[PDB]
């Protein structure tokens, strides 16, 4: 028995972790109305996508990985001795990458495909990947890993801040004058993930209190966990994510695992500019 672990590109793992563990990636795409397509990878210039997103008069569309992209890596991993494949996917409540990962694995013979619904995104979804690899090396069989990843999912979440009432209007969720009810007013909607779905939490003015809202909300949850792994997931506002990341290191004991990361074009296409999140895991995930 040999078990492999792969995922889609929305888990935004570091290129070091991908290269070290040979993690195969099924990329998501984002197509603008200009005809230009950005296939998610660690080769694009994220700053130039943000400029293109601000350039484009309309917000682009997102697409899950093509079924053929899942197949070629599935049959590849099979064509090297892997008896089982664990697939951590983007949350099925927000995307169709989990549906395509299951159906494509049914069309690949010789290996047992195990699609997992992360019920989240970004490095929090990537934490499931690093936890699956850690268990495979320890000598765990697939359903033992899925049972653990299902248990880890019960103590895992992510809050996020949206600072782009602009981008919220070109998508049709707020009217033209509603942007001029928050932008001048500096109102920041605060959302959170629940059961794989993005539901509204609070609407805190100023980004500072909204960031302080993220800290107090996540710290009050993880204070009852035996193991804690925090992840600052920042957008194109570098100073905002670092201020929260540094404030966390000062306010949290070193027993807590505090990490920094950034999301890519697919997640940014829906968040816009200045997006910022804060996720947590009830486990001491191996990030090395
Ligand atoms: C930084 C906080 C994480 C925010 C995650 C936003 C996810 C919403 C975008 C949904 C992407 C759907 C992808 C697809 O079309 O298949």
Numbering used by the authors: 1 to 288
Q: What do the study's own words say?
A:
Staphylococcus aureus FakB1 is a prototypical bacterial FA transfer protein that binds palmitate within a narrow, buried tunnel. Here, we use a combination of X-ray crystallography, NMR spectroscopy, MD simulations, site-directed mutagenesis, and functional biochemical assays to characterize the membrane-bound conformation of FakB. This study focuses on FakB1, an FA transfer protein from S. aureus that binds palmitic acid (16:0) before presenting it to FakA for phosphorylation and exchange with the membrane. The bacterial class of FA transfer proteins is called FakB, and the bound acyl chains are completely enclosed within the protein interior. The open conformation arises from a conformational change in the dynamic region that rotates helix α8 outward to uncover the FA-binding tunnel and reorganizes the adjacent α8-β9 loop into a new amphipathic helix.
We identified two alanine residues (121 and 158) in the tunnel and mutated them to bulkier residues to partially occlude the FA-binding pocket and push the FA out of its pocket to destabilize the fully closed FakB1 conformation. We also determined the 2.33 Å crystal structure of FakB1(A158L), which was structurally identical to FakB1(A121I). The open FakB1(A158L) molA structure superimposes on the FakB1(A121I) molA structure with an RMSD of 0.265 Å. A similar process occurs in FakB1(A158L). First, compared with the wild-type protein, the thermal stabilities of FakB1(A121I) and FakB1(A158L) were reduced by 6 °C and 4 °C, respectively, showing that the mutations indeed prevent FakB1 from adopting its most stable conformation. When expressed in Escherichia coli, the total amount of FA incorporated by the FakB1 mutant proteins was the same as the wild-type protein, but FakB1 only supported the incorporation of palmitic acid (16:0), whereas both mutant proteins were less specific and also incorporated oleate (18:1) and linoleate (18:2). The FakB1(A121I) and FakB1(A158L) crystal structures capture the open conformation that is generated by the introduction of bulkier side chains into the FA-binding pocket and stabilized by the crystal packing architecture that creates a surrogate hydrophobic environment that favors the formation of helix α8′.
